[PDB]
Ligand binder design. Structure first.
Ligand SMILES: [Mg+2]
Lengths: 50, 251, 50, 277, 1340
DNA sequence: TCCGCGTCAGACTCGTAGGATTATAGCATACGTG
DNA sequence: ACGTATGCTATAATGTGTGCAGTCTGACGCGG
């Protein structure tokens, strides 16, 4: 986004500043669940050969 | 096998078997009649469809769906992949002398110690109570020792407390990433349904006291008691195998 | 590659325990191969000493 | 081209005779007197009729390919026993056979637990009576409500409904989510775990020591009777086969062994303690 | 302001006056199912639609037919009360009128031959409560609204199917409501293809040929025309100046008089206006230019009659000369352009191997039914059946609407079937996008994600019932006799009943209501999912779906979704969000008229949101006028920037519309990271209601709205005075203005008393009103399990202090005082339901008597003679609740048992044992027991004692109904009689049974006395049949499963206390396990002495970035500071005027406080009942984003004579010496999550074993050992610990020899390894042998 | 032998929750065991 | 005798279809 978030957590986010924070928040936590399987599957792959 | 509810239950193999036998016997019947070949052809195609569906259902064509519109589990399926015998019922096993529970902090414990609930360790060390009981002469037989434990009488706590001393227990946290995902400690009986874990080794498990559960396992054999104290004890496991660096570090 | 190096070991038990289990067994059946057990997966399966 | 077993057969019937009234009679007259080729034709010809009859008897028990095979066997028994001399058509006579042979073969291979026709035939009338009632009662009929309209037994209706009770496969997922089936829950009946195995082993070993600790002539007519040490569980009168050869003295010695053993259970700390069990 | 509000007012720090008041939160669920049953006369909706759609059904011959007339709902067999208890669906009879009409065959259509007509039952439909729940088999269950791809048309493009080419291949796809799919797609060579059902790929001109389109017509539809005239000798060509645009002059371009562009030169916009103003129409051209151009229409030699050149063939020099001398000096060719008007259909026809219409229907038929030899009718029937039959295909209203507005059409509402026009129009816009104009739609836009609530889904499932009946009707009609066969003999009631119960049970959307909290009920009914049937899958689910889309604004909550693999798909609905009449979502918006922000509101669709520019609610209104500032921060087109005043068209109504219900309850959400905010709103739903409902000191205001709309409380239907207060029920007398003149006017509210929840927790309704209190219409009369004066009370607030404590708050670990445990405030209730089943085994029937073999008098002490435990009897694990005995078969009494049964005698008779005993570990109090018996075998004596109560309690309860209803009915007549014949005591001499005897003069009030007289009799006669229904349903034998004879259901009531292991959290996602319940001696305490309740870790804050909890703490402390001042004045017993000044000074402090509550309006008595509730602490409301800021909180802290900082001087309890420096202390509203340790901990030594794997079972549910998976295994392999693993592969798991052998060795003391080889492997051997593979164990 | 497109293989690890189907006629001798 | 199983009916009828269609990266295996 061309316009970033000016406020902080002490000052309080406005309504959009939170809406904007969501986009990054949900996708960061989506890659906590889904991307772990590729990395956990790597553990499996490595082990069998070694 | 029959359910408690008067219902029965059968595996999908029995169902797939009945498809094979029916069609095979119907072919015997049609070869008795010397039927025209066009029909014999269908019967042979059918027979193959049933056999191929029995060995590996979902492969040649549509897998034969059953009652709940789902596909029948074939033979190959019980040897196939995660859900097969290998990964699920052979390399992976549910195990006796095992319990799990919410963990909480143990800031009083030393490194080689961990809080173990009494009623947990009670059930866990059940055959060790019956054993030390016959030695003292408090139990003449084992169903006598069984009732002694059940009544939870005062003097049974003191025997349980006797066997547990100088006895390590394995503490596992999911998921088991590296070897340090299991470490052994000397159980300390505590009144309460919560396990109490040492803060410094929290790093190895990645165990956050935000509602984590840890599986307990009792090493039965003397070799397992030595292995747990020698290899898997928390004091003998300091540095990470990945990097020659201490994972046991305050935070 | 890892996925391939696991299926290459003379131990077919170690290979089927991994993946491609439908293929491993058929190739091992036709060859008539006998696994004399060296790996860990092999002896953990049978429940013997590692 | 075509690699569906369904469409292949359905192709081959689509290229088969479609017989006229006098044609049917010509072939059929020779078919009874065994023309070989004739019996093959009438059959080949009316496979198309079997398919249209299995189109209405589908989605109920077995697949469409299983109804056609057993429907073909009805057309064959119809050809083994048709009357060409009669002025009535064949398509009419063969339909009675193809509808029967299908219904019968479904009644057998539909249920896992084999249900003979007798129990089944009746079940249907109980179920078809439930239809009538359901529409006018607007309430699915009870075992009683079905019994009151037929004026038949209560347990009959109920026991016939017990055989209708259908199955869940052991390998069926739970909660519409591949997580665990019923086999990963359902316990094993036969084998009770070590605790129950060692119960009997320890209980019996203590008994062996109790017999050796008791009188030698008191545990010789007690364990040999109940079949504890001996090989067969005999009775008071049958212990005479061993060495006792008595009826009164066997009964006094049996009870004398039990009286001294009842004091052995009061002193060890059981008696009323092991009486609850 | 109201009375129930006068008792306790919440100080509101809002500064954005609510123009729109929060709607009923359970709007969707109730309105949706309301449509389904709604018998609309014409505008078919729900069932009425389902019948008109399928019906009328006619035989396969078409001589007889069944026609739908009308349907109806009978009142429920068992009401909610009964249904919840017995355990069968709360459903209503479906009676539909059918009409069997039969025609004459040789005659034309003898319609009037036998018009048979009758009414028929088919299936019982589960009804919806007033809570928006379905009672299925005695479980209030909720059906979640689905979110699916909206039918119509959709343009997509895999931005690189083959990154080999890396070409953006564009594709179109027609998605119907019912029917086959229709896709169009390009390829590396830009050849248009069509793939019905995404099956085979077929050239896209084959479908057009099937719609009867000659090669010529096809070209004429898509491509434009280029005219070529051969005049005398010079070849000439028509030029629209705007054609050789952005191309190169391959030849010398010269006109009537002028050379414009030179060979090999780009024709610019200048050259185009040069030619266009000169009015150029014709240009002479070379013959080498046509070589490459495609001829359009066919050209036969006028002379011979043969095609010189067929349509769509690339011309050459020799073909053109053959055409010039044939006698055609007017040629038509294609306007091909590699840049704009692209030649696709042209190159596609060259691939297209078909010929005419009839041949095009062949390859279409050879695709879908390959192998069957095709005929004229089979090929035609199939294609016509796909997208062109009223039966197979249906776009629906939404389908045709989205389909039309996607093609920028003329119609909103049109035909369910695809017309020829539609298909080609779709191919056209696909080709438009390919050219450059037109944008593809994106699926994540909610304009393409439609919402389908229960009612629409219930409609769909009800159709399949009708479809499955259609089969049985047609086949029975044709061959069956016409006359004899009745219409109900052909109908079946099971296929409809089974197909609907399939939905109300097996479906992923039909799941058990999460009712462990009012917030859980209301947020779970407002759940919306993309999963289950006709949706998506974790296996299939991508990322961009899950991601928050700027359409969500105002419609869906950005922070409300599980953090599990089902993360982005599941989502709660926004606060003020509502469904579009067609299906999409829509959000309220304040219209701006000529700059003036008008109070008129418009719910803008997902589509029209993008159009207008929308100001934010942060923007300031000028108190009826316009935006105070010239520049306003607004948003549109899915982006955000500043705009001028006149440019603003709309504005966000409230500041809470972005978020959901779950999130609207979090105070200071504005100071909380979205990641922790999500977890906080997710755990707030898991908050088990406490023993004593404690109101939240630090709320948002939404509290009351949730508690009331959840339908868990009992709110007043009509205002008036509470005639009677009771723990079980409430009786209210209605005021004259509201009360109807017909009836008596006395409402009855029998409050739900303590009974179970779906999560095994308490459900109570306590009266929140005093005896004889004046109550206004729509006021909360009784509070729920988690509500307090109507406001939501999920958990409890307490004095908290942020600081470490000897590591007892290490990683978010919690240190709670014993004083919290002493007040039993976080102590919870758990109503557990257990059952005892008497079955019919092969050996014989079971019964229920006190006679149980092998038992202590101690066990049968709490039981009665019948064999059921007394009401109020405390029970513990091992004690038997209900005595049961089953038949014992041929039993092999082992020699050691025959001797033991002969010594201690007690020769037990042919009978077994299976009594229902308290599960090992549970202990509570039996609060009630219910007995269900089949209609037959004689009853238990306890079952008769319970019938005694139900009856005699119902006789009393109905006596009380007719009694108080009488008193309210004569109370009216008494007032009517005075009007006219005024006589007080003389009228009240004789009894009240002779009052209908007295009358009045010819008057309206004489007609009133007749109404009340015959209505008194109406209730008097009604009372008997009300008694009949009660009496019968108590005598009625309750229908049970086959095999079952009778059942006894016990209700326990466990009181679990908080303890180490219990998981608690705030509402800012701040999790934690209680590690230690500190002694009151050891708890830190302020200079003044009162101790702290919980000690939290300050490190669970920076990393987390959820500063809302600290603000919750500070305000909570300020709020309490004010309660502590009010508490002191009420203790000191001061004055009404002194409290008035201070409390007025408290309510009015904020900058622009929303509520301006004057206390000069409040009477003295009304002030003191208010202050008495304010003393625990002044409840404060901090709207989600319009909450309080530091200036306001620190100003409130000065009123409370609290520190500005919020940090207090704390002293260590252990010691007494002060801590080295101040610590934040305040009141944080924390919660007790359902994850309690008593429900967690498990232990096993040896127990059950699996059926084939022969390893132990799984879970504490079945008493199973923990799984040691392969990952757990590799850990021991790494250690080197070999036995520890082999021990966990064999003796602890399968090894049947090992497990029992090892057990015996441990009790001997000899912990000795004795392996053999797991059964699960011995299984794998035979399993591979069963697959026809020789797998034997080759020895040494 | 190379290119296109068909099938076929994987997708971290442990804890907990609860529910239900349709229908196969109708009647008379043929085949198996106390 | 009781339970199960086998057997026949005679208007004419003669070729099925059914049901989820945002998975995806990566890897071969048959033709063309
Ligand atoms: Mg955690």
């Amino acid at each position: 986004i061309e316009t970033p978030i000016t406020a902080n957590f002490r000052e309080g986010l406005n309504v959009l500043q939170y809406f904007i924070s969501t986009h990054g928040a949900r996708k960061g936590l989506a890659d906590t669940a889904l991307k772990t399987a590729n990395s956990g599957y790597l553990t499996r792959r490595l082990v069998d050969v070694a | 096998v029959p359910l408690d509810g008067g219902r029965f239950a059968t595996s999908d193999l029995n169902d797939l078997y009945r498809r094979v036998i029916n069609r095979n016997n119907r072919l015997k019947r049609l070869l008795d009649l010397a039927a025209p070949d066009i029909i014999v052809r269908n019967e042979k195609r059918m027979l193959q469809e049933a056999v191929d569906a029995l060995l590996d259902n979902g492969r040649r064509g549509r897998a034969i769906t059953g009652s709940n519109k789902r596909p029948l589990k074939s033979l190959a399926d019980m040897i196939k992949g995660k859900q097969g015998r290998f990964r699920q019922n052979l390399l992976g096993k549910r195990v006796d002398y095992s319990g799990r529970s919410v963990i909480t902090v143990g800031p009083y414990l030393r490194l080689h110690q961990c809080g173990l609930p009494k009623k947990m360790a009670l059930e866990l060390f059940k055959p060790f109570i019956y054993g030390k009981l016959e030695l003292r002469g408090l139990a003449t037989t084992i169903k006598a020792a069984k009732k002694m434990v059940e009544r939870e009488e005062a003097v049974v706590w003191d025997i349980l407390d006797e066997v547990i001393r100088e006895h390590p227990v394995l503490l596992n946290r999911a998921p088991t990433l590296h070897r340090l995902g299991i470490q052994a400690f000397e159980p300390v009986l505590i009144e309460g349904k919560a396990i109490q874990l040492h803060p410094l080794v929290c790093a190895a498990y990645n165990a956050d006291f935000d509602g984590d559960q840890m599986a307990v396992h009792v090493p039965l054999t003397l070799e397992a008691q030595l292995e747990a104290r020698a290899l898997m004890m928390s004091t003998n496991n300091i540095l990470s195998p990945a990097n020659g660096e201490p994972i046991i570090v305050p935070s | 590659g890892i996925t391939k190096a696991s299926l290459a070991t003379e131990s077919f038990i170690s290979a089927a325990s991994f993946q491609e289990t439908t293929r491993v067994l058929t190739e091992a059946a036709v060859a008539g191969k006998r696994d004399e057990l060296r790996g860990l997966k092999e002896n953990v399966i049978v429940g013997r000493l590692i | 081209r075509v690699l569906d077993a369904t469409q292949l057969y359905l192709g081959e019937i689509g290229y088969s005779p479609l017989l006229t009234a006098e044609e049917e009679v010509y072939f059929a007259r020779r078919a009874l007197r065994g023309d070989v080729a004739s019996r093959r034709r009438m059959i080949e010809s009316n496979l198309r009729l079997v398919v249209k009859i299995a189109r209405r008897y589908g989605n109920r028990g077995l697949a469409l390919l299983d109804l056609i095979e057993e429907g073909n066997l009805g057309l064959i028994r119809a050809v083994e026993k048709f009357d060409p001399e009669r002025g009535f058509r064949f398509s009419t006579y063969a339909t009675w056979w193809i509808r029967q042979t299908i219904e019968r073969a479904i009644m057998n291979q539909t249920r896992t637990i084999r249900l003979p026709i007798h129990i089944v035939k009746e079940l249907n009338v109980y179920l078809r009576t439930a239809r009538e009632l359901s529409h006018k009662l607007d309430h699915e009929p009870s075992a009683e409500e079905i019994a009151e309209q037929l004026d038949k037994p209560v347990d009959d209706v109920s026991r016939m409904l017990r055989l209708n009770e259908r199955i869940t496969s052991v390998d069926t997922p739970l909660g519409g989510d591949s997580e665990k089936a019923l086999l990963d829950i359902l316990a094993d009946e036969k084998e009770n775990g070590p605790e129950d195995t060692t119960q009997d082993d320890d209980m019996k070993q203590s008994i062996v020591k109790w017999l050796f600790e008791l009188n030698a002539k008191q545990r010789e007519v007690l364990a040999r009777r109940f079949g504890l040490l001996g090989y067969e569980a005999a009775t008071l009168e049958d212990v005479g086969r061993e060495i006792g050869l008595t009826r009164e003295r066997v009964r006094q010695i049996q009870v004398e062994g039990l009286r001294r053993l009842r004091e052995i259970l009061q002193t060890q700390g059981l008696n009323i303690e092991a009486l609850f069990l | 302001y109201s009375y129930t509000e006068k008792k306790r007012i919440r100080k509101d720090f809002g500064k954005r006056p609510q123009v729109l008041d929060v709607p009923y939160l359970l709007s969707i669920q109730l309105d949706s199912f309301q449509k389904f049953i709604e018998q609309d006369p014409e505008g078919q909706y729900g069932l009425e639609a389902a019948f008109r759609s399928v019906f009328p059904i006619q035989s396969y011959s078409g001589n007889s037919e069944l026609q739908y007339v009308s349907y109806r709902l009978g009142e429920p067999v068992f009401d909610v009360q009964e249904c919840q208890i017995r355990g069968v669906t709360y459903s209503a009879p479906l009676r539909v009128k059918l009409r069997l009409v039969i025609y004459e065959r040789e005659a034309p259509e003898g319609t009037v031959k036998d018009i048979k007509e009758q009414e028929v039952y088919m299936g019982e439909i589960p009804l919806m409560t007033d809570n928006g729940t379905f009672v299925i088999n005695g479980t209030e269950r909720v059906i979640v609204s689905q979110l699916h791809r909206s039918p119509g048309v959709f343009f997509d493009s895999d931005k690189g199917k083959t990154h080999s080419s890396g070409k953006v291949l564009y594709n179109a796809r027609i998605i119907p409501y019912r029917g086959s799919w229709l896709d169009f797609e390009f390829d590396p060579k830009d050849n248009l293809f069509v793939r019905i059902d995404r099956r085979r790929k077929l050239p896209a001109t084959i479908i057009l040929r099937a719609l009867n389109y000659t090669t010529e017509q096809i070209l004429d539809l898509f491509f434009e025309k280029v005219i070529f005239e051969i005049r005398d000798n010079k070849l000439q060509m028509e030029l629209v100046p705007e054609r050789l645009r952005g191309e190169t002059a391959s030849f010398d371009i010269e006109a009537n008089g002028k050379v414009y562009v030179e060979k090999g030169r780009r024709i610019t916009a200048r050259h185009i206006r040069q030619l266009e103003k000169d009015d150029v129409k014709l240009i002479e051209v070379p013959v080498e230019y046509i070589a490459g151009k495609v001829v359009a229409k066919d050209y036969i030699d006028e002379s011979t009659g043969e095609l010189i050149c067929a349509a769509n063939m690339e011309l050459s020099l020799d073909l053109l000369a053959k055409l010039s001398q044939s006698g055609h000096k007017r040629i038509e060719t294609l306007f091909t352009n590699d840049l704009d008007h692209g030649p696709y259909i042209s190159e596609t026809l060259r691939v297209d191997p078909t010929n005419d219409r009839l041949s095009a229907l062949v390859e279409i038929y050879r695709m879908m039914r390959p192998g069957e030899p095709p005929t004229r009718e089979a090929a035609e029937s199939l294609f016509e059946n796909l997208f062109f039959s009223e039966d197979r295909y249906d776009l629906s209203a939404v389908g045709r609407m989205k389909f039309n507005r996607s093609l920028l059409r003329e119609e909103i509402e049109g035909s369910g079937i695809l017309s020829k026009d539609d298909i080609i129009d779709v191919m056209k816009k696909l080709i438009d996008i390919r050219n450059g104009k037109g944008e593809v739609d994106d699926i994540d836009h909610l304009g393409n994600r439609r919402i389908r609530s229960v009612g629409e889904m219930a409609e769909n499932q009800f159709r399949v019932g009708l479809v499955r009946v259609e089969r049985a009707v047609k086949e029975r009609l044709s061959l069956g006799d016409l006359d004899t066969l009745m219409p109900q003999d052909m109908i079946n009631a099971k296929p409809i009943s089974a197909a609907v119960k399939e939905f109300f049970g097996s479906s992923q959307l039909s799941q058990f209501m999460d009712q462990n909290n009012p917030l859980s009920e209301i947020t779970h009914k407002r759940r919306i999912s993309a999963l289950g049937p006709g949706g998506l899958t974790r296996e299939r689910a991508g990322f961009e779906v899950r991601d928050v889309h700027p359409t969500h604004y105002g419609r869906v909550c950005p922070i409300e979704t599980p953090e599990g693999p089902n993360i982005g798909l599941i989502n709660s609905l926004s606060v003020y969000a509502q469904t579009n009449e067609y299906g999409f979502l829509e959000t309220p918006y304040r219209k701006v008229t000529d700059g003036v922000v008008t109070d008129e509101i418009h719910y803008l669709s997902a589509i029209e949101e993008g159009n207008y520019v929308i100001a934010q609610a942060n923007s300031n209104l000028d108190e009826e006028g316009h935006f105070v500032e010239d520049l306003v921060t607004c948003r549109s087109k899915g982006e955000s920037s500043l705009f001028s005043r006149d440019q603003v068209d709309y504005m966000d109504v409230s500041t809470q519309q972005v978020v959901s219900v779950g999130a609207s309850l979090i105070p200071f959400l504005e100071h909380d990271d979205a990641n922790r905010a999500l977890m906080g709103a997710n755990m707030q739903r898991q908050a088990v209601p406490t023993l004593r409902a404690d109101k939240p000191l630090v709320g948002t205001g939404m509290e009351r709205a949730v508690a009331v709309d959840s339908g868990v409380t009992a709110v007043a239907k009509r205002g008036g005075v509470v005639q009677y207060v009771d723990a079980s029920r409430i009786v209210i007398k209605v005021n004259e203005d509201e009360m109807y003149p017909g009836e008596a006017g006395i409402d009855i509210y029998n409050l739900t008393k303590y009974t179970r929840s779906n999560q095994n927790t308490c459900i109570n309704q306590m009266p929140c009103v005093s005896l004889g209190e004046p109550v206004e219409r729509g006021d909360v009369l009784a509070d729920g399990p988690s509500t307090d004066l109507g406001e939501l009370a999920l958990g409890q607030n307490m004095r908290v202090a942020f600081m470490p404590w000897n590591g007892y708050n290490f990683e978010d670990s919690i240190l709670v005082s014993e004083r919290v445990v002493q007040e039993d405030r976080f102590t919870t209730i758990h109503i557990q339901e257990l059952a005892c089943v008497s079955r019919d085994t092969k050996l014989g029937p079971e019964e229920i008597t006190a006679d149980i073999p092998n038992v202590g008098e101690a066990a049968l002490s709490k039981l009665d003679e019948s064999g059921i435990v007394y009401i109020g009897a405390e029970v513990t694990g091992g004690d038997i609740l209900v005595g049961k005995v089953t038949p014992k078969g041929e039993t092999q009494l082992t020699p050691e048992e025959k001797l033991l049964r002969a010594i201690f005698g007690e020769k037990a008779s042919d009978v077994k044992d299976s009594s229902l005993r308290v599960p090992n570990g549970v202990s509570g109090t039996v609060i009630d027991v219910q007995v269900f018996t089949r209609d037959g075998v004689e009853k238990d004596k306890r079952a008769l004692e319970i019938e005694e109560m139900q009856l005699k309690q119902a006789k009393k309860d109905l006596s009380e109904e007719l009694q108080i209803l009488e008193a309210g009915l004569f109370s009216r007549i008494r007032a009517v009689l005075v009007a006219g014949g005024v006589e007080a005591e003389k009228l009240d001499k004789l009894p009240r049974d002779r009052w209908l005897e007295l009358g009045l003069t010819d008057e309206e009030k004489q007609n009133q006395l007749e109404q009340l007289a015959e209505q008194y009799d109406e209730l008097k006669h009604e009372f008997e049949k009300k008694l009949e229904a009660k009496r019968r349903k108590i005598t009625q034998g309750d229908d049970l499963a086959p095999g079952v004879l009778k059942i006894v259901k016990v209700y326990l009531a466990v009181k679990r206390r908080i303890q180490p292991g219990d998981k608690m959290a705030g509402r800012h996602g701040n999790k934690g396990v209680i590690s230690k319940i500190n002694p009151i001696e050891d708890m830190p305490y302020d200079e003044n002495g009162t101790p702290v309740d919980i000690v939290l870790n300050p490190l669970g804050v920076p990393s987390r970035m959820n500063i809302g909890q600290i603000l919750e703490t500070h305000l909570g402390m300020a709020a309490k500071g004010i309660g502590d001042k009010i508490n002191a004045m009420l203790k000191q017993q001061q004055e009404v005027a002194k409290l008035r000044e201070f409390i007025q000074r408290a309510y009015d402090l904020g900058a622009d406080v929303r509520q301006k509550v004057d206390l000069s309006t409040f009477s003295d008595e009304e002030v003191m009942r208010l202050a008495e509730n304010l003393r625990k602490g002044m409840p404060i409301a901090t709207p989600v984003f319009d909450g309080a800021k530091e200036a306001e909180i620190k100003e409130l802290l000065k009123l409370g004579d609290l520190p500005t900082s919020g940090q207090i001087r704390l002293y260590d309890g252990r010691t007494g010496e002060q801590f080295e420096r101040p610590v934040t202390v305040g009141y944080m509203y924390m919660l007790k999550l359902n994850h309690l340790v008593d429900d967690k901990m498990h232990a096993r030594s040896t127990g059950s074993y699996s059926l084939v794997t022969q390893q132990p079972l799984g879970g504490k549910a079945q008493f199973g050992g923990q799984r040691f998976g392969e990952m757990e295994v590799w850990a021991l392999e790494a250690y080197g610990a070999a036995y520890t693993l082999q021990e966990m592969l064999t003796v602890k798991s399968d090894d049947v020899n090992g497990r029992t052998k090892m057990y015996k060795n441990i009790v001997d003391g000899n912990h000795q390894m004795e392996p053999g080889m797991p059964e699960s492997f011995n299984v794998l051997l035979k399993e591979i042998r069963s697959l026809g593979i020789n797998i034997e164990l080759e020895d040494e």
